[PDB]
Design a protein around this ligand. Structure first.
Ligand code: HEM
Ligand code: F
Length: 153
């Protein structure tokens, strides 16, 4: 699909819609994760020793917000520039995943959890053109982090 001026316009628009409700979209996102893979729970400090996914845990919200922002920034960068740029942050990201016991096969878990989360976020405006656009942007960003984990291990 490439990332036409028209496709980028579509991701920006849909991320603005996501940020618009962090405590919801982020707790949803963690539930979609634990649905696709239950075992994932022991990983998260703020999920350990608990039984259910905490709903007002600042640690949890701050965490999940950061995740989506990063995927959107990635899509704009693709339309303007044609690429996703690797910086200090993406590199430190790779380190912390590894400390915490996260692997590659965990990534389609968090992807589907994000496509499903955005399909839920944009509702009837959903188009093939839009699905195509977030898919392109995640894929392109995951490619970059997975790269940095391998390097932190
Ligand atoms: C493009 C996709 C992804 C992005 C942009 C991303 C981003 C991040 C960021 C920014 C942090 C640190 C947050 C903080 O300091 O507060 C973090 C921590 C973490 N992430 Fe990810 N992530 C991605 C995929 C994944 C996957 C697939 C898993 C595995 C299930 C995972 C598991 C974790 C864990 C266990 C921590 C440590 C949390 C702690 O115990 O406090 N992430 N991630
Ligand atoms: F994460």
């Amino acid at each position: 699909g490439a990332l036409t001026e028209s496709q980028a316009a579509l991701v920006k628009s849909s991320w603005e819609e996501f940020n618009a409700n962090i405590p919801k979209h982020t707790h949803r996102f963690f539930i979609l994760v634990l649905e696709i893979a239950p075992a994932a729970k022991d990983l998260f400090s703020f999920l350990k020793g608990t039984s259910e996914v905490p709903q007002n845990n600042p640690e949890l919200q701050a965490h999940a917000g950061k995740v989506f922002k990063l995927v959107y920034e990635a899509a704009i960068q693709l339309e303007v520039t044609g690429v996703v740029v690797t910086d200090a942050t993406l590199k430190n990201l790779g380190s912390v995943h590894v400390s915490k016991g996260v692997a590659d096969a965990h990534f389609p878990v968090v992807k589907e959890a994000i496509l499903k989360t955005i399909k839920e976020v944009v509702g009837a405006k959903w188009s093939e053109e839009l699905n195509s656009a977030w898919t392109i942007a995640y894929d392109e960003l995951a490619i970059v982090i997975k790269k940095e984990m391998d390097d932190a291990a």
